[PDB]
Structure 1
Amino acid sequence: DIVMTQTPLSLPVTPGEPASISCRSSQSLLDSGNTYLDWYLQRPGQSPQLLIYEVSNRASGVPDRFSGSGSDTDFTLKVSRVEAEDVGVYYCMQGIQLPYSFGQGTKVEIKRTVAAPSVFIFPPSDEQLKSGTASVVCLLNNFYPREAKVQWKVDNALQSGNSQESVTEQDSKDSTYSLSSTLTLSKADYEKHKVYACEVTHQGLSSPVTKSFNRGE
């Protein structure tokens, strides 16, 4: 089967600045008179869509700041001016021989100015406590860059191993991330302790921010 390889696998770029992605086939994609090499864009939470076909033809709706070039076995996707809405994963695909095969994907990340998170803490709902479980949620909202640290403290005891984090894909308009950390406790343990706190460390914060609440207040 044809092996497709793409580079770089991550591409950070500032809106307004150009970008390019290289693809390389293990065999020639020329049919002595078309070359069957395509580019697909997968935006966050969407399926792939065709961006360029046959090396250099733009699919419907694709503006001319995108172009493709190459020949035989080496190909390049170029964007002359990136926009924040370009965030996604770009894939090369050969169609000269079944099975069609894809390169690994290049994740375009949009660079922007540092943005500190807004932090919010949520106690377990009375509804959940009635069910017999307790989840505390800490939300870090609309921040950049992605690296953030969340620590949980329960009556000043550091929690280790009983929380899980989930992070959004970069937003297509403001190029930020959001993050949730969920601390899981049994109802008995939640009801034994008083102060619940999430401490956030981020490049945009001059010192760590703590949001906390007292069970019952």
Structure 2
Amino acid sequence: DIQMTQSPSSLSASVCDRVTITCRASQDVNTAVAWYQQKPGKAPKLLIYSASFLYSGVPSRFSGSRSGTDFTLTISSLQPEDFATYYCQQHYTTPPTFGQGTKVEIKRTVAAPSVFIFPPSDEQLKSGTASVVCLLNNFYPREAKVQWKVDNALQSGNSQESVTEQDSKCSTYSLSSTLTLSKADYEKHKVYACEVTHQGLSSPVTKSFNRG
């Protein structure tokens, strides 16, 4: 109806860096805009109401200004607790319409993973399957690859990569690769390995096992 066009859709700034998010209203809304912070899989949290006002309890880093139809949330000092998606919302009319959201990530010194290798359970072998885990812990940046070289083979069928969201104190991601194998698959092979080359490493470091 009245659309709020929010930029940018994606961001990366290191601590205390100055941060500006901009939402522009297709029509004049007056002062009838509010700014919100939705942390990973929590509900939205009001930072700023009436365009410029700071919700009680919100830190002073956060600020809001208007330029007629152009609106700005600024964080003077970006803190890692600040990692969220930030939303503008107009409420001058019905419907209330929100921005497409700005997702803020925190640049931190390079930090390499803590690779662990885990086997398929005897109650998992009993269930009649055989799924293997390769846990890269607390590492920055995001980008890396988990190559499973089971009995020295590179199998594109199985690879399933769930990453956690930036930690709110370190801003290291963690990643799980899982080898999808019906027990039939697994019965034969014995040596099993997952290999990783990251921006934290001067060497790809492998973590392997054998059945005993």
Higher mean alpha-carbon deviation, 84-93 vs 5-14, is at 5-14
Structure 1 residues 34-91: Cα deviation after superposition (integer angstroms, max 9, x where no partner): x111100011231101110111111121111110001321011101111111000000
Displacement of 1:148 after TM fit? 1.1
Q: Give the corresponding residue for 1:154.
A: 150
Q: Hey, what does 2:27 align to over in structure 1?
A: 27
Matching residue of 2:74: 78
Which among 123, 142, 166 is matched to residue 127 of structure 1?
Answer: 123
Provide Cα deviations, 1:100-136, integer angstroms capped at 9, x if missing partner.
1111110110110000000011110111010011110
Q: State the match for 1:142 in structure 2.
A: 138
Listed as ranges, the matches of 1:60-139 within 5 Å are: 60-139=56-135
Cα distance in 1, alignment partners of residues 59 and 127 from structure 2: 53
d(CA) in 1 for partners of 2:56 and 2:159? 45
Shift of 1:143: 0.4
Matched residues, number: 212
Cα distance in 1 for partners of 2:88, 2:157 equals 39
The separation in 1 between residues aligned to 2:32 and 2:40, in whole angstroms, is: 26
Indicate whether 1:198 and 2:190 are aligned: no
Shift of 1:189: 1.5
Counterparts of 1:186 and 1:44, CA distance in 2: 33
Q: TM-score, normalised by structure 2?
A: 0.98
Structure 1 residue 175, shift from structure 2 partner: 0.6
Letter in 2 for 1:93: Q
| Corresponding residue for residue 203 of structure 2 | 207
Tell me what 1:49 maps to: 45
1:6 aligns with 2:10: no
> Which runs of structure 1 show a deviation greater than 4 angstroms over 4 or more consecutive aligned residues?
none
Distance in structure 2 (CA, Å) of the matches to 1:13 and 1:161: 36
- How far off is 1:93 after superposition? 0.5
Secondary structure of residue in 1 paired with 2:126? helix
- How far is 1:210 from its partner? 0.3
- Asked if the contact 2:150–2:194 (Cα under 8 Å) also holds between the matched residues in 1, the reply is no
1:18 paired with 2:14, answer no
1:40 to 36, 39, 43: 36
SS of 1:173's equivalent in the other structure is coil
Code of the aligned partner of 2:18: P
More strand by share: 1
Q: Does 1:186 align with 2:182?
A: yes
2:50 corresponds to which letter in structure 1? E
